[PDB]
From a paper:
A large fraction of cellular proteins likely start to fold cotranslationally in the ~100 Å long exit tunnel in the ribosomal large subunit, before they emerge into the cytosolic environment. In E. coli ribosomes, portions of the 23S rRNA and a few universally conserved proteins line the exit tunnel, Figure 1A. The tunnel proteins uL4, uL22, and uL23 consist of globular domains that are buried within the rRNA, and β-hairpin loops that protrude into the tunnel. These loops help stabilize the tertiary structure of 23S rRNA and contribute towards the unique geometry of the tunnel. uL24 and uL29 are located near the end of the tunnel, and a hairpin loop in uL24 forms a finger-like structure that partially obstructs the tunnel exit port.
The E. coli strains HDB143 (uL23 Δloop; uL23 residues 65–74 deleted) and HDB144 (uL24 Δloop; uL24 residues 43–57 deleted) have previously been shown to be viable, as is a strain where uL23 has been replaced by a homologue from spinach chloroplast ribosomes that also lacks the β-hairpin loop. Compared to WT E. coli ribosomes, the tunnel volume increases by 2,064 Å3 in uL23 Δloop ribosomes, see Video 1, about 1/3 of the size of ADR1a (5,880 Å3) calculated by the same method. The initial model for uL23 Δloop was built with Coot, and improved by energy minimization in a solvated dodecahedron box of explicit TIP3P waters, neutralized with chloride ions and using the Amber 99SB-ILDN force field. Even after minimization, the backbone of the new loop formed after the deletion of residues 65–74 still showed improper geometry and Ramachandran outliers, so we used kinematic sampling to model alternative loop conformations, and then we selected the loop that could fit the electron density and had the best Ramachandran score. The additional space available in uL23 Δloop ribosomes makes it possible for ADR1a to start to fold at 3–4 residues shorter linker lengths (Lonset). Assuming an extended conformation of the linker segment (~3 Å per residue), ADR1a folds ~9–12 Å deeper in the exit tunnel in uL23 Δloop ribosomes than in WT ribosomes.
Residue numbers in the entry: 1 to 82
The structure:
Amino acid sequence: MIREERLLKVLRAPHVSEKASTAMEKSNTIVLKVAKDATKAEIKAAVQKLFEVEVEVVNTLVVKRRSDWKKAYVTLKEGQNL
């Protein structure tokens, strides 16, 4: 299933973009910069271990720019740290 060196690389940054603020304060959901491959199953596995929170669902999309950057919307349960 997992090898930790991959979880440490599957996430690349947090992402701040106004709808990223409204994703949290309205809809218990955090917005991330993830690997150019990744997959939703790995993105959930990375957040649930690095950030110690339960995850409900992960949805993904891309900026359509030269570096083809993968955004992830990770929805949490009820309470969160950051």
